[PDB]
Amino acid sequence: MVVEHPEFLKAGKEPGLQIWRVEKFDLVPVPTNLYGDFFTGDAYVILKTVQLRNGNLQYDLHYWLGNECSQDESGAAAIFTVQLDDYLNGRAVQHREVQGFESATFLGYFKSGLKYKKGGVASGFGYKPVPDEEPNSTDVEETLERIKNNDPKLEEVNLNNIRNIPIPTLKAYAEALKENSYVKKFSIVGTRSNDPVAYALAEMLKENKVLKTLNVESNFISGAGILRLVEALPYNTSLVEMKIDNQSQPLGNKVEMEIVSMLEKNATLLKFGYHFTQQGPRLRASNAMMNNNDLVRKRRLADLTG
């Protein structure tokens, strides 16, 4: 887009010559009695405004790079040139001029010939091995008891990477969560969970009104198990994250399709952790989540008293 700057305002307003120097990421005017005396350690921006019959002005933008100027100075000169052109409705013709190789036109701007002098303003520029974590110390039995007791102090349940949780214990977790009022996050990554676990979790999502986050990554849930989970989504308006990636087997093209169809029938889920294989559903999913997330933005704008 087009940008303002006190010097832009002054640019090309009449026929003549204007010289600015790049000084610490700003465009600074050169005193008119120093015109044509270029610091070889610096970078400059020159605008030649020529007048023509229309009353309209002709514009030629030159950025001059001294041999010892720093990368921030030549980059800024270049960018400021583009910005100045844009501000001038794109009508300037841009010229790169390097010390010792300046164009005849540019050299011609300087009646007495341009000079070089040494120096200038200073640049504006200013392990691990194998999993070293103590294991998940979460107590499976105790925690299940708390979810059953509807324990107010229990909001986060992380059973990640815990060895030998019976499948009936995980199914029990899902059953207890049906009536629990306090657990907002539940994850069971890499606990060897399979379809029975996912089926029970699916039923639970139809009833539970509090769970925000569900993570079942890195288990052995099939496409059928994953499908059943998302088939619960239209009966759910509280879950916002479902992470399902890295199951032991690819879900299958047909399933990916049935899945995005369900994602389009829920306006609440904001994140779906799954890398789609087919591009059709991949983009449908990305768009569905983007749609649902924009609903958050809009109600955040409306609840803004107006």
Binding site: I79, S123, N161
Partner: protein
């Protein structure tokens, strides 16, 4: 307060602070998850590993790359990369810092919006901006007109740029880059009696590629020289740490860039894609393009590549054309440096998309302000 610059690529994240001359954090753009080969009690409560730490365990984990061929295709894992970049690598609270992101040429429109949405909804940045990678490289080289060859780990683009802006109809994308080259060197090292076929081996062959490969000026000649002399051969100490030798593989590997058939791709070589890209442009700007060929990205680091490019393009171009290849020593970080300069400019304050402007417009604001 200080702005952040994050340059996210297929293989590497480059991140740091606006106003710095170089990125402060460079790490692999990867997320690692356990293999289903038993419960890794060692992971604790973690569901995955990110960046360097996931790399350390590349033998224990299955690694996923949320950016493919320069395009973000896994938005959830990309959230992980970005969280890890802010909180672990740069140690900043993203809601205190304007953030500049980069995107690939020809980035689909929905992706730009999604990037905008995630920065504001998930990270609550106060302001952000998205800039085209190749353009930032051209700006870091002190130019508003030129044709960039950007080659990284996942993708190679030729990006012609005039008076500040890319010419999208002339952009070409070649899905051939440093990871393919690493994989190919693994192969031809295996041809002469060495075992390298993934993980601790893919990463070490990458190091071999970076340290010993080079682009031959005349390829058929270099092959003949290689047979005779031995003056080209060099050796390399493994970590284990046996010592191996390597010869014509030094330049066969990146020859693939000029001869994609070496790995069964039908595509033309990068010299030819550069040419085709210039030829899709207005006649009146082709001279400027030919005279400002700017190399960007890690796969343009091979010694010899600029000369080889100069030679190949001369043979393609009208006889009377001035041709020049620019190959800055810091071109591994050109994109990031260009972003650092841009976000530092006194005119850049008004270019940010602010939280308020996003709140009112939604993410499609990105097509109007980041342009």
């Amino acid at each position: 307060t200080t702005a952040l610059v994050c340059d996210n690529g297929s293989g590497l994240v480059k991140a740091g602070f606006a106003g710095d001359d170089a990125p402060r954090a460079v790490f692999p753009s990867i997320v690692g998850r356990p293999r289903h080969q038993g419960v890794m009690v060692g992971m604790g409560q973690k569901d995955s590993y990110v960046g360097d730490e996931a790399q350390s365990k590349r033998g224990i984990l299955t690694l996923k790359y949320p950016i493919e061929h320069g395009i973000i295709t896994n938005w959830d894992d990309m959230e992980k990369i970005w969280h890890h970049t802010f909180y672990n690598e740069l140690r900043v609270a993203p809601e205190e810092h304007p953030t500049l992101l980069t995107e690939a040429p020809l980035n689909p429109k929905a992706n730009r919006e999604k990037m905008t949405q995630i920065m504001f909804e998930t990270f609550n940045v106060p302001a952000m901006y998205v800039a085209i990678q190749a353009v930032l490289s051209l700006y870091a080289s002190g130019r508003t007109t030129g044709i960039v060859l950007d080659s990284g780990d996942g993708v190679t683009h030729n990006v012609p740029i005039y008076e500040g802006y890319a010419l999208p109809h002339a952009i070409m994308r070649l899905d051939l880059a440093g990871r393919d080259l690493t994989d190919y060197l693994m192969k031809i090292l295996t041809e002469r009696g060495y075992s390298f076929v993934t993980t601790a081996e893919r990463e070490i062959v990458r190091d071999i590629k970076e340290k010993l490969c080079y682009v031959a000026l005349d390829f058929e000649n270099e092959m003949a020289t290689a047979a005779s002399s031995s003056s080209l051969e060099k050796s390399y100490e493994l970590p284990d740490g046996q010592v191996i030798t390597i010869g014509n593989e030094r330049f066969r590997c990146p020859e693939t860039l000029f001869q994609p058939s070496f790995i069964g791709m039908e595509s033309a070589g990068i010299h030819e894609t550069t040419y085709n890209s210039i030829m899709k442009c207005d006649i009146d700007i082709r001279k400027d393009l030919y005279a400002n060929n700017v190399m960007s990205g890690g796969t343009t680091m091979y010694p010899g590549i600029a000369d080889r490019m100069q030679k190949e393009i001369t043979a393609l171009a009208p006889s009377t054309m001035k041709i020049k290849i620019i190959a800055p020593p810091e071109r591994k970080y050109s994109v990031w440096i260009g972003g650092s300069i841009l976000a530092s400019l006194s005119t850049f304050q008004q270019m940010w998309i602010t939280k308020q402007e996003y709140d009112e417009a939604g993410p499609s604001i990105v097509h109007r302000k980041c342009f």
